[PDB]
Design a protein around this ligand. Structure first.
Ligand SMILES: *C/C=C/c1ccc2c(c1)C(C)(C)c1cc(N(CC)CC)ccc1-2
Length: 133
């Protein structure tokens, strides 16, 4: 349950527009993003992660090592520089993105066949559920 490897198909997506609005994503782009099918592919080898989020139009890929801070430029998202850090809190995978936005990051809970993802920015929380294909 610390093993997030898999191809993950989105099955629920709560308050996605509110989270994108907290990031100041263009209303235009928000309009398109809500309609698109998103696939989350995770390749994990020990502390080494490669995450790829893919849709018809957008692509968001990141690689990181657990417990090692890394500069991130969210080029395909809100286009901001953050100092990111991913750690384990028990079996919860937790990302903090330090920068302009407060309470910015995400958390991942892997429960067997299902992956729960909460994305946070400011006062907004988006809740997603994925099933392993
Ligand atoms: C552990 C999961 C983290 C994470 C990081 C970044 C993104 C996501 C998940 C997605 C799948 C929710 C996602 C989607 C998007 N686009 C729409 C706004 C689509 C590619 C960007 C970034 C992330």
């Amino acid at each position: 349950t610390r093993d997030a490897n898999g191809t993950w198909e989105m099955e629920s997506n709560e308050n996605f527009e509110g989270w994108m609005k907290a990031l100041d994503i263009d209303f235009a782009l928000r309009k398109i993003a809500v309609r698109l099918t998103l696939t989350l592919v995770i390749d994990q080898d020990g502390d080494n992660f490669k995450v790829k989020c893919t849709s018809t139009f957008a692509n968001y890929d990141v690689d990181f090592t657990v417990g090692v801070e890394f500069d991130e430029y969210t080029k395909s998202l809100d286009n901001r520089h953050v100092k990111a850090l991913v750690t384990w809190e028990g079996d919860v995978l937790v990302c903090v993105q330090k920068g302009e936005k407060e309470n910015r990051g995400w958390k991942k809970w892997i429960e067997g066949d299902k992956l729960y993802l909460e994305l946070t920015c400011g006062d907004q929380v988006c809740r997603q559920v994925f099933k392993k294909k």
